[PDB]
């Protein structure tokens, strides 16, 4: 499917130790554009995915403090079914990217901004997917809910920028989240 270079946040989520991986099944998957560091802003979908009776994978620019310390130790305790990884890429791009994922999963990315706030999250901003594997260099999902419909229409975006690109170096990384999306169907 798709697979990013951005590995777990914590080795203690594994859950698969025989390939030091984490293996989580039809997960549902929190996009975040923003650092995750208090577990009360996670409450509402930590309620709603354990409601579904689904694990959680968290797609965040970043998950630390209290929250990576909280989310660790209920996971070890077996309190809580989740995975924690740093979004992939940085700035503008990790956003275009995120949103890469999102519409490979049939979810939104919560970011702050306006209506966009994690609190607010609902199961309907969560992506899901068949399968989710992680391990210490890479998350791979598998088979997103995503519509084909939508996945091809953000390829299209993207090769349409392609198009624009003027610089080695950024068709470089436009194409390089084509094959990702295209070949993550």
Same mark, same amino acid.
């Given at each position: 499917?798709?697979?990013?270079?951005?590995?777990?946040?914590?080795?203690?989520?594994?859950?698969?130790?025989?390939?030091?991986?984490?293996?989580?099944?039809?997960?549902?998957?929190?996009l975040?554009?923003?650092?995750?560091?208090?577990?009360? =802003?996670? $409450?509402?979908?930590?309620?709603? +995915?354990?409601?579904?009776?689904?694990?959680?994978? &968290? *797609?965040?620019?970043?998950? @630390?403090?209290?929250?990576?310390?909280?989310?660790?130790?209920?996971?070890?305790?077996?309190?809580?079914?989740?995975?924690?990884?740093?979004?992939?890429?940085?700035?503008?791009?990790?956003?275009?990217?995120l949103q890469d994922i999102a519409t490979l999963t049939?979810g939104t990315v919560?970011?702050?901004?306006?209506?966009?706030?994690?609190?607010?999250?609902?199961? =309907?901003? $969560?992506g899901?997917?068949?399968? +989710?594997?992680?391990?210490?260099?890479?998350?791979? &999902? *598998?088979?997103?809910?995503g @519509?084909?419909?939508?996945?091809?229409?953000?390829?299209?975006?993207?090769?349409?920028?392609?198009?624009?690109?003027?610089?080695?170096?950024?068709?470089?990384?436009?194409?390089?989240?084509?094959?990702?999306?295209?070949?993550?169907?």
């Amino acid at each position: 499917g798709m697979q990013f270079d951005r590995g777990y946040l914590s080795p203690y989520f594994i859950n698969k130790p025989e390939t030091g991986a984490v293996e989580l099944e039809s997960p549902f998957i929190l996009l975040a554009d923003k650092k995750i560091s208090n577990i009360r =802003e996670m $409450l509402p979908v930590l309620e709603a +995915v354990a409601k579904a009776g689904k694990p959680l994978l &968290i *797609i965040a620019e970043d998950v @630390e403090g209290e929250a990576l310390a909280t989310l660790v130790v209920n996971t070890m305790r077996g309190i809580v079914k989740v995975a924690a990884v740093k979004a992939p890429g940085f700035g503008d791009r990790r956003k275009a990217m995120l949103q890469d994922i999102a519409t490979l999963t049939g979810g939104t990315v919560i970011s702050e901004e306006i209506g966009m706030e994690l609190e607010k999250a609902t199961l =309907e901003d $969560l992506g899901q997917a068949k399968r +989710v594997v992680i391990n210490k260099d890479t998350t791979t &999902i *598998i088979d997103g809910v995503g @519509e084909e419909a939508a996945i091809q229409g953000r390829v299209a975006q993207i090769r349409q920028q392609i198009e624009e690109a003027t610089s080695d170096y950024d068709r470089e990384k436009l194409q390089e989240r084509v094959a990702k999306l295209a070949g993550g169907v």
